[PDB]
C-alpha cells in the first residue's frame, strides 16, 4: 500500500489484530493523513499522535471533509516545527476512534455496527495498530513520535514497546501510568454517558437516538480538568453571560462557555468512541508486564524530550518529572510555561514548537 | 413560647414568612436547630456553627435515633473541645432549602404537596436571614461568633458583613469572597447532571416513587473529586483494581469503586432537590453584590475574623483565602493549614482547625 496524496485522506487495511486481552478484531482499517514528502529511504517519518477527541487532521483550514481546522494548525509545513520540506508528518486516526478508523460506530461482518460488541482496547493496542498501519506502507522505523495526553501515552508505549522502530520521541503532558484522579473523573465521565437512557447498552447506533445529554455532561466536566483554575476566573469570573440573569433562567459566562464546548463535540464525536477511548486511558500503565514503571523506563534507550505544563490540573507536573528522571534518554524535565492547564500543549504554539524542534534534532 | 431544644435533640423553630433577596416570598419557613451547652447569664456566648453543602445541624455526636451518621465535626463542641461547652453555647441550624430538617424543596407547602419546582432560588444572604430570624424567634439577637467552612464559610462571611453589630467574631475556612469560574463551572454542570435524569420530572418527583438517583450520584462523584487532593488519591488508590475485579473485562478500578460508594452514601441521606437549590446558592455567592464590589464590602466590615485555608484545596484554592485575609481589616493574616486531603481538610484536620476555632473564640472574648 502507498501513502495517501499529501493532504488527502487514506485508509490502510492492516487485517486482523490480536489485542493484549486476547480478543481478535478483524478487518481493521486505520485512517491516515500525511504532510511532507517521503524520503527515498523511508526514514524521515514523524508520526503525530492525537489525543482523546482528535483525528488525523493535524493541520490545515476547515471546510469540506473537515468541520474544524487541525488541532495543531501550523505544526507541519515549510519552516514549521515539523519541517515538511525534509520531514514526513504522518498522522493516523487512533484505533477505536470515529474519524475513519475502526471503532464502535464502524460496521462488523454481520453488516451492523460494532456497538457494545467492540472489544476493550489499551494504549498498547492502539500502538500496535499504528505500527501495523505504517508497516502496511513499507515503513518499519520512524524518525520520531510526538503527542500529548493520549497521544503522549501512545508515544510512550511506542518508544518503550518498539524502541528499535523509532529514533526519538516527544512526550508531552503525560505520565507513566493513569492516576487515581484521572481514572476517577474518567470512569465517572463514562458513567455519565452510560446513565443516559439513549445509551442503549452501547448499541444506539442507527437507532435514531444517541446519548447526547450524557456526552455533553462528560465533555463539560472533562474540559474543566483541561484548563487552569486561575485562567478560568481571570477570564470568566462569576460574570453573567451578556445581560442574562442566572437567578431566573440565565447563565453564567463560564456556564455558557462550557455548553458551547460540549456542543462542538456532539457535532463531530461519537459517544461509543468516547467510552472506548476513555477506558483505554484508564488502562494506561507502562510498567504492566515489564517489571514496574521504574524498570520499564530505566530499560528504555530511545532519546526522548519530556515536556510538562505548570498549571496542568489533569496531568500534574510531578508526573512528567518522574518520566524524565527515569528515562535514560531524557536529559531533564522541559517545563512549558502556560496558564491554560492541560490545553497548554495545544495553545502554546512557540513553546511546543521548540520542544518539537529539539526532538527532531535527536532523530538526526 | 418557642424554646431551644434539649442538648442532643432537634428543634423546629417557626419564623413565619420570609421575603427573599429576589423579591419572592417563602411562607411558613421552618428552621431545624440543635444546641450544645447552656446559655450564659447575658446570653452572650452563642457560637453559631454553619454547615457546608450537604451538612446538617448534627455537628457532633455519635449515630443514633434520627442521626444515621455521626456529626461532620465529631468532637468540635463539648467539655474542653474547641467550642468548650463549659463556656460557650454551640448552636447549629439546618440551612434554608435543606432537606435535613428545615424548609426546602421536599417539605410540604400550604397546598398539601411538596414545594418541588415551586421552591424559589435562594442566595447565601437568604440563608443568613433565616438563621438570624430563627435565633430572633427564640430571643437571641446577638451571637459571640460564627464559624464554618465552604458554604458554611460563605454563610459566616455574609453574616459578619451583613450583621456586623450582632456578631463579635467569625471563622472563615476554605472559602472565597465570591464564587469562582471553576466552581460555577463544575457546580452548574452538576445541576445539569441531576436535571438530565429522566426521573427529575422538572423537580416534582418527590411523591411519585421515582427519584433522579442516577443524576445525583453523578453530581456527587464529580463533586467529591474536587473535595480531595490529587496526591492523596494517587497514594491511596493509584491505578489499582478494586478487589479481584478486572477493568479489562468490565471491572472497576479502586478509585472508581470509592467514588461510587460516595455517591450512594449521599444518595440515601440527601434530597436531589435540595442539592440543586443549595448548589445554586453557592453559584450566586458574591459578598460584593449591592455593596460596590468585593473590595468595598470587605473593607467596610470591621469584625475580627480568623481566615484559614488548606494547602491542597482544589475547589477553594489557597489564593481565595489569601484574598479574604488581605481585604478584611479585622483579619491579622492568613492562617495556612497543611493538609493532603484537599478541601476536605477543614473536616479532617480536627487538631489544626481546632486551634483556629480557639483563636476565633478568643477574639469573641476580647470583644465582649
Ligand atoms: C481549542 C482549545 C484546545 C484551546 O483553544 P483556546 O485558545 O483555549 O480557545 P477557547 O476554548 O478558550 O475559546 C474559543 C471558543 O470558546 C468560545 N467561547 C468563549 N467564551 C464563550 C462564552 N462565554 N459562551 C460561549 N462560547 C464562548 C469562543 O466563541 C470560541 O468558539 P469557537 O470554537 O467557535 O471558536 C480548547 O479551547 C478546546 O476547544 N478544547 C480543549 C480540550 C481538548 O481539545 N482536549 C483534547 C486534548 S487532551
Ligand atoms: C466525611 C468525609 C470527610 C470522610 O472523609 P475521610 O474520613 O477522609 O474518609 P473517606 O470517606 O475518604 O473513606 C472512608 C469511606 O470510604 C469507603 N471506601 C474506602 N475505599 C473504598 C473503596 N475502594 N471502594 C469503596 N468504598 C471505599 C470506606 O469503606 C469508608 O466508608 P464509610 O463512608 O461507610 O465509612 C467524606 O468522605 C464524607 O463522607 N462526606 C463529606 C461531605 C461533604 O460535603 N464534604 C465536603 C464539605 S461540603
Curated annotation (Swiss-Prot), chain B:
Known SUPFAM superfamilies for this protein?
Answer: alpha/beta-Hydrolases
Top EC class per UniProt? transferase
Q: Which residues form the signal peptide?
A: none
One Gene Ontology molecular-function label? homoserine O-acetyltransferase activity
Catalytic activity annotated for this protein? Answer: L-homoserine + acetyl-CoA = O-acetyl-L-homoserine + CoA
Pathway it acts in? Answer: Amino-acid biosynthesis; L-methionine biosynthesis via de novo pathway; O-acetyl-L-homoserine from L-homoserine: step 1/1
InterPro entries listed in its UniProt record: AB_hydrolase_1, AB_hydrolase_fold, HAT_MetX-like
Q: What is its EC number?
A: 2.3.1.31
For the ligand (substrate), the binding residues are 220, 344
Q: Which GO terms describe its cellular component?
A: cytoplasm; plasma membrane
Biological process (GO) annotations? methionine biosynthetic process
Keyword Protein biosynthesis found: no
Q: Where is the AB hydrolase-1 domain?
A: 45-349
Where does the record say this protein resides?
Answer: Cytoplasm
User: What is the active site of this protein?
Assistant: 150 (nucleophile), 313, 343
UniProt-listed Gene3D superfamilies? alpha/beta hydrolase
Q: Report keywords, A-Z.
A: Acyltransferase, Amino-acid biosynthesis, Cytoplasm, Methionine biosynthesis, Transferase
How does the annotation summarize its subunit structure? Homodimer.
What family is this?
A: Belongs to the AB hydrolase superfamily. MetX family.
**Functional note:** Transfers an acetyl group from acetyl-CoA to L-homoserine, forming acetyl-L-homoserine.
Recorded hits in NCBIfam families, A to Z, give: homoserO_Ac_trn (TIGR01392), PRK00175.1 (NF001209)
Q: What is this protein called?
A: Homoserine O-acetyltransferase
Organism, as annotated = Mycobacterium tuberculosis (strain ATCC 25618 / H37Rv)
User: What does the organism's lineage look like at the top?
Assistant: Bacteria, Bacillati, Actinomycetota, Actinomycetes, Mycobacteriales
Amino acid at each position: 500500500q502507498t501513502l495517501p496524496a499529501e493532504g488527502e485522506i487514506g485508509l490502510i487495511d492492516v487485517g486482523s489484530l490480536q489485542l493484549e486481552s486476547g480478543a481478535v478484531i478483524d478487518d481493521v482499517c486505520i485512517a491516515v493523513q500525511r504532510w511532507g514528502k517521503l524520503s527515498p529511504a523511508r526514514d524521515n517519518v514523524v508520526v503525530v499522535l492525537h489525543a482523546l477527541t482528535g483525528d488525523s487532521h493535524i493541520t490545515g483550514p476547515a471546510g469540506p471533509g473537515h468541520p474544524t481546522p487541525g488541532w495543531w494548525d501550523g505544526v507541519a509545513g515549510p519552516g514549521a516545527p515539523i519541517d515538511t520540506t525534509r520531514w514526513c508528518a504522518v498522522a493516523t486516526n487512533v484505533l477505536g476512534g470515529c474519524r475513519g478508523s475502526t471503532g464502535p460506530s464502524s460496521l462488523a461482518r454481520d453488516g451492523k455496527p460494532w456497538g457494545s460488541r467492540f472489544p476493550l482496547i489499551s494504549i498498547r493496542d492502539q500502538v500496535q495498530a499504528d505500527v501495523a498501519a505504517l508497516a502496511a506502507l513499507g515503513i518499519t522505523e520512524v524518525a520520531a513520535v510526538v503527542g500529548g495526553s493520549m497521544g503522549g501515552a501512545r508515544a510512550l508505549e511506542w518508544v518503550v514497546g518498539y524502541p528499535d522502530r523509532v529514533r526519538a520521541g516527544l512526550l508531552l503532558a503525560v505520565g507513566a501510568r493513569a492516576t487515581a484522579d484521572q481514572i476517577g473523573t474518567q470512569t465517572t465521565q463514562i458513567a455519565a454517558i452510560k446513565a443516559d437512557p439513549d445509551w442503549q447498552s452501547g448499541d444506539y447506533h442507527e437507532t435514531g437516538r444517541a446519548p447526547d445529554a450524557g456526552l455533553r455532561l462528560a465533555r463539560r466536566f472533562a474540559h474543566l480538568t483541561y484548563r487552569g483554575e486561575i485562567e478560568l476566573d481571570t477570564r470568566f469570573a462569576n460574570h453573567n453571560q451578556g445581560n442574562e440573569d442566572p437567578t431566573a433562567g440565565g447563565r453564567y459566562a463560564v456556564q455558557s462557555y462550557l455548553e458551547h464546548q460540549g456542543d462542538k463535540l456532539l457535532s463531530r464525536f461519537d459517544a461509543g468512541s468516547y467510552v472506548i477511548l476513555t477506558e483505554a486511558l484508564n488502562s494506561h500503565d507502562v510498567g504492566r508486564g515489564r517489571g514496574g514503571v521504574s524498570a520499564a523506563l530505566r530499560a528504555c534507550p530511545v532519546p526522548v524530550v519530556v515536556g510538562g505544563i505548570t498549571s496542568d490540573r489533569l496531568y500534574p507536573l510531578r508526573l512528567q518529572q518522574e518520566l524524565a528522571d527515569l528515562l535514560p534518554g531524557c536529559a531533564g524535565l522541559r517545563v512549558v510555561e502556560s496558564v491554560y492547564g492541560h490545553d497548554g500543549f495545544l495553545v502554546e504554539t512557540e513553546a511546543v514548537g521548540e520542544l518539537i524542534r529539539q526532538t527532531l534534532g535527536l532523530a538526526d
